[PDB]
Amino acid sequence: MEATLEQRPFPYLATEANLLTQIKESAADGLFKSFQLLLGKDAREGSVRFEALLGVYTNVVEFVKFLETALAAACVNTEFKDLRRMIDGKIQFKISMPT
Amino acid sequence: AMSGPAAYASYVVRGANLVTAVSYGRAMRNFEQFMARIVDHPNALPSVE
Amino acid sequence: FTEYAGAIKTITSALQFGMDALERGLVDTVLAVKLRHAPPVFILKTLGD
Amino acid sequence: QAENAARLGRQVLGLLPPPTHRVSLTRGPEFARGVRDLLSKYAASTRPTVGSLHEALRQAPFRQPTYGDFLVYSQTFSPQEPLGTFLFSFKQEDNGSSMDMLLTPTSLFMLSGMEAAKAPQTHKVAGVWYGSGSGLADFIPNLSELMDTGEFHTLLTPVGPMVQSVHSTFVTKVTSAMKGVGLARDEPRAHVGLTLPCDMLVDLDESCPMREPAGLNVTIYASLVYLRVNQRPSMALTFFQSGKGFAEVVAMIKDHFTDVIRTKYIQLRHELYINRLVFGAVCTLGTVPFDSHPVHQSLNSLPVLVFANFEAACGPWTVFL
Numbered sequence: 001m002e003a004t005l006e007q008r009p010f011p012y013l014a015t016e017a018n019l020l021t022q023i024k025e026s027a028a029d030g031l032f033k034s035f036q037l038l039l040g041k042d043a044r045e046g047s048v049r050f051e052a053l054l055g056v057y058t059n060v061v062e063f064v065k066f067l068e069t070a071l072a073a074a075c076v077n078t079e080f081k082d083l084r085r086m087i088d089g090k091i092q093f094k095i096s097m098p099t
Numbered sequence: 100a101m102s103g104p105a106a107y108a109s110y111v112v113r114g115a116n117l118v119t120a121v122s123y124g125r126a127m128r129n130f131e132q133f134m135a136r137i138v139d140h141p142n143a144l145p146s147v148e
Numbered sequence: 149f150t151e152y153a154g155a156i157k158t159i160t161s162a163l164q165f166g167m168d169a170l171e172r173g174l175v176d177t178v179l180a181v182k183l184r185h186a187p188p189v190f191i192l193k194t195l196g197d
Numbered sequence: 198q199a200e201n202a203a204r205l206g207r208q209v210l211g212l213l214p215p216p217t218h219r220v221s222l223t224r225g226p227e228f229a230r231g232v233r234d235l236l237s238k239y240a241a242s243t244r245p246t247v248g249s250l251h252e253a254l255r256q257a258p259f260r261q262p263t264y265g266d267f268l269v270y271s272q273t274f275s276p277q278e279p280l281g282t283f284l285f286s287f288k289q290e291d292n293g294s295s296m297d298m299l300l301t302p303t304s305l306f307m308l309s310g311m312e313a314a315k316a317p318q319t320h321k322v323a324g325v326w327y328g329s330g331s332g333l334a335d336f337i338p339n340l341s342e343l344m345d346t347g348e349f350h351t352l353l354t355p356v357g358p359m360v361q362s363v364h365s366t367f368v369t370k371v372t373s374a375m376k377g378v379g380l381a382r383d384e385p386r387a388h389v390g391l392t393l394p395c396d397m398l399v400d401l402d403e404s405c406p407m408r409e410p411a412g413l414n415v416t417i418y419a420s421l422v423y424l425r426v427n428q429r430p431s432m433a434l435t436f437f438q439s440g441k442g443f444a445e446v447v448a449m450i451k452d453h454f455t456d457v458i459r460t461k462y463i464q465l466r467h468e469l470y471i472n473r474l475v476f477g478a479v480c481t482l483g484t485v486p487f488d489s490h491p492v493h494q495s496l497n498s499l500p501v502l503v504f505a506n507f508e509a510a511c512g513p514w515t516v517f518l
Binding site: 156159160163166167 | 247
Binding site: 010011048050051052053054055058060 | 120121122124126128145146147
């Protein structure tokens with residue numbers, strides 16, 4: 001990005017030394033780049049104008065625990081530390097049937 | 100019956116916005132709030148409340 | 149500082165994303181266990197009597 | 198002023214190759230505590246944080262490429278480039294103390310002299326970086342005879358992508374990259390990828406699907422084809438992007454260049470010169486990781502692809518036909 005000129009009404013500062021000598025020649029043959037002439041009927045501070053940010057609006061993901069869903073009433077939850085160690089689980093039922 | 104505001108909300112640019120508004124050509128809604136997060140609490144996560 | 153502390157916010161929000169995409173894994177697979185063992189009404193109803 | 202020198206105490210002692218793992222036996226089993234990067238399964242918690250895993254991120258693999266430093270005439274290397282082009286080191290004879298000749302693929306299109314319709318995009322762009330084709334032909338007077346007997350694919354050594362180029366009026370310095378990911382100079386903490394013009398690249402894997410397996414690897418191949426146009430010998434350089442392995446693509450490149458084989462070899466029913474039988478060569482420009490999207494760009498227009506995470510690994514030239 002090349003830095004450009006702009007006519008925005010800066011709070012300019014004054015220097016003790018002058019500038020004005022040999023400027024009229026230097027507009028015709030370029031001593032320096034980035035210059036723009038201004039005649040006295042239009043040499044002023046321009047009306048300041050802008051655009052704006054009005055907000056940065058961002059979603060927040062509220063996490064939903066499995067234990068605090070009401071789905072978990074259909075399950076029995078046990079914290080089991082080392083589950084990679086287990087091979088197989090097994091539950092045994094014994095049903096007696098009277099006559 | 101209902102209840103609400105009677106007047107419009109206010110948004111005028113103060114001196115902190117006006118330096119950016121003249122020079123940089125941009126302004127920003129509630130510059131004092133952006134200062135509370137970028138330079139004052141840079142590791143505050145964006146919460147809801 | 150605000151590049152550093154703006155980088156520690158990104159990596160947590162990438163990693164809070166890590167855990168909370170796995171808590172959805174519970175609610176997926178538990179519901180996926182139920183549907184494997186869920187026959188419809190018209191099959192099971194007359195077996196109920 | 199020594200605070201500036203205290204910075205070099207930090208950065209140089211922080212950036213070193215890791216030293217050799219050597220522990221005396223009288224210390225005991227302390228050496229097992231000195232092995233951290235081989236540990237690859239870090240523990241997690243209910244709410245993990247950076248402070249729980251700042252040790253986990255600290256071990257990183259050891260990656261440092263080997264650069265190339267070339268001193269080039271400012272006429273051959275065009276003074277403006279997109280900083281990621283591919284290169285070639287042409288070599289004939291050490292005549293000077295240190296002068297080197299470098300060829301971008303836009304420049305090698307100008308020494309070729311093929312028709313405009315083979316590459317309809319780069320011909321306008323490569324015609325404005327250079328003259329009519331005699332600005333570069335003055336340095337190699339044998340471009341008629343290097344095409345006949347077919348020695349041109351033996352004189353190119355593929356180098357890789359650019360990194361940095363400081364330009365002066367007569368002499369242009371070129372900093373190239375080999376072995377992998379070149380570090381970007383101007384932007385800190387960035388990585389220079391390899392950029393090809395969209396016109397020169399020819400994709401190989403393209404299906405409706407109407408299934409192919411995935412992998413970690415896809416290898417860019419360079420190609421260079423000897424041909425004849427207007428009864429004058431000229432070359433043609435194309436690129437390939439495929440992960441099919443070397444046993445397939447040699448059969449696949451033959452199907453791409455079917456017409457070029459046929460239109461040449463109509464001539465040799467009349468004259469059969471054994472020097473003319475050599476046709477083309479294929480090098481290996483290094484691997485690309487899988488599923489990286491090549492992103493289209495636009496320059497001046499000129500559309501230019503880009504490959505993030507490119508690594509270079511040069512290979513031989515093998516003569517396919």
